[PDB]
Design a protein around this motif. Structure first.
Motif, PDB file in Angstrom:
ATOM      1  N   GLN A  41     -28.523 -52.092  29.495  1.00 27.88           N
ATOM      2  CA  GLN A  41     -27.283 -51.672  30.146  1.00 27.88           C
ATOM      3  C   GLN A  41     -27.537 -51.346  31.615  1.00 27.88           C
ATOM      4  N   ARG A  42     -26.763 -51.942  32.496  1.00 29.30           N
ATOM      5  CA  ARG A  42     -26.665 -51.479  33.879  1.00 29.30           C
ATOM      6  C   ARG A  42     -25.267 -50.905  34.120  1.00 29.30           C
ATOM      7  N   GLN A  49     -25.307 -48.140  41.631  1.00 30.53           N
ATOM      8  CA  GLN A  49     -25.922 -48.201  40.331  1.00 30.53           C
ATOM      9  C   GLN A  49     -26.242 -46.780  39.907  1.00 30.53           C
ATOM     10  N   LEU A  50     -25.884 -46.439  38.664  1.00 31.35           N
ATOM     11  CA  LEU A  50     -26.115 -45.104  38.134  1.00 31.35           C
ATOM     12  C   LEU A  50     -27.515 -45.054  37.550  1.00 31.35           C
ATOM     13  N   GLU A  51     -28.311 -44.089  38.010  1.00 27.77           N
ATOM     14  CA  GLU A  51     -29.717 -44.007  37.662  1.00 27.77           C
ATOM     15  C   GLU A  51     -29.906 -42.965  36.572  1.00 27.77           C
ATOM     16  N   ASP A  52     -30.720 -43.304  35.601  1.00 24.93           N
ATOM     17  CA  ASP A  52     -31.121 -42.354  34.577  1.00 24.93           C
ATOM     18  C   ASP A  52     -31.598 -41.054  35.207  1.00 24.93           C
ATOM     19  N   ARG A  54     -29.794 -38.750  36.243  1.00 21.55           N
ATOM     20  CA  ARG A  54     -28.664 -38.118  36.916  1.00 21.55           C
ATOM     21  C   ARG A  54     -27.517 -37.875  35.922  1.00 21.55           C
ATOM     22  N   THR A  55     -26.571 -37.047  36.332  1.00 18.43           N
ATOM     23  CA  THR A  55     -25.389 -36.853  35.509  1.00 18.43           C
ATOM     24  C   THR A  55     -24.204 -37.548  36.144  1.00 18.43           C
ATOM     25  N   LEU A  56     -23.097 -37.559  35.390  1.00 19.11           N
ATOM     26  CA  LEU A  56     -21.848 -38.077  35.918  1.00 19.11           C
ATOM     27  C   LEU A  56     -21.446 -37.338  37.170  1.00 19.11           C
ATOM     28  N   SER A  57     -21.532 -36.008  37.146  1.00 20.14           N
ATOM     29  CA  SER A  57     -21.063 -35.244  38.275  1.00 20.14           C
ATOM     30  C   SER A  57     -21.823 -35.579  39.557  1.00 20.14           C
ATOM     31  N   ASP A  58     -22.967 -36.257  39.470  1.00 19.32           N
ATOM     32  CA  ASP A  58     -23.701 -36.640  40.670  1.00 19.32           C
ATOM     33  C   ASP A  58     -23.017 -37.741  41.465  1.00 19.32           C
ATOM     34  N   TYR A  59     -22.005 -38.426  40.905  1.00 19.78           N
ATOM     35  CA  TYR A  59     -21.490 -39.659  41.500  1.00 19.78           C
ATOM     36  C   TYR A  59     -19.996 -39.634  41.833  1.00 19.78           C
ATOM     37  N   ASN A  60     -19.319 -38.480  41.681  1.00 22.53           N
ATOM     38  CA  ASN A  60     -17.840 -38.294  41.737  1.00 22.53           C
ATOM     39  C   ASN A  60     -17.094 -39.102  40.692  1.00 22.53           C
ATOM     40  N   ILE A  61     -17.617 -39.111  39.484  1.00 23.67           N
ATOM     41  CA  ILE A  61     -16.893 -39.651  38.341  1.00 23.67           C
ATOM     42  C   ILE A  61     -16.034 -38.516  37.811  1.00 23.67           C
ATOM     43  N   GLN A  62     -14.758 -38.802  37.556  1.00 19.58           N
ATOM     44  CA  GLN A  62     -13.791 -37.787  37.176  1.00 19.58           C
ATOM     45  C   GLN A  62     -13.103 -38.228  35.895  1.00 19.58           C
ATOM     46  N   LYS A  63     -12.162 -37.413  35.444  1.00 19.18           N
ATOM     47  CA  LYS A  63     -11.381 -37.775  34.284  1.00 19.18           C
ATOM     48  C   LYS A  63     -10.766 -39.162  34.468  1.00 19.18           C
ATOM     49  N   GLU A  64     -10.900 -39.988  33.423  1.00 19.51           N
ATOM     50  CA  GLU A  64     -10.319 -41.336  33.357  1.00 19.51           C
ATOM     51  C   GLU A  64     -10.761 -42.220  34.517  1.00 19.51           C
TER      52      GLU A  64
END
Lengths: 73, 73
Positions: A41-42, A49-52, A54-64
């Motif tokens: 999976q990439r 690219q999301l790196e192992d 890290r968390t979601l909150s590291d990338y400005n991923i939000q609800k939906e």
């Protein structure tokens, strides 16, 4: 929260996650639903690219928010 | 990051790498996918031959840059 994971080909998968979830956690949820091992999976969000580790909150991923999943090395 | 490796004849290969990867590392990824031993690989970026021991970051290779691969001594 609920995030979306879109493949190159079109198919979406809905996930249940927290900002606290790590990226490898996320791939393991994608493993639970579609049988794709995490190592194949990439994950991408807004051109990054999301790196192992890290968390979601590291990338400005939000609800939906919607990630893109690209599928061997 | 993702870089592209274009042959003389046209075929491209997509690689996953870091700036930290050495040139021989890069040839080993090309070995993994296409079966070409590194000793038969010549890699070029912008007219410069990439020398073993150096990394990508030594040559201003960036995200979605394209190297050229030339194929016995």
């Amino acid at each position: 929260m609920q995030i979306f994971v879109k493949t190159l080909t079109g198919k979406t998968i809905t996930l249940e996650v927290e900002p606290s979830d790590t990226i490898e956690n996320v791939k393991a949820k994608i493993q639970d639903k579609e049988g794709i091992p995490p190592d194949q999976q990439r994950l991408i969000f807004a051109g990054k690219q999301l790196e192992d580790g890290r968390t979601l909150s590291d990338y400005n991923i939000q609800k939906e928010s919607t990630l893109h999943l690209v599928l061997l090395r």
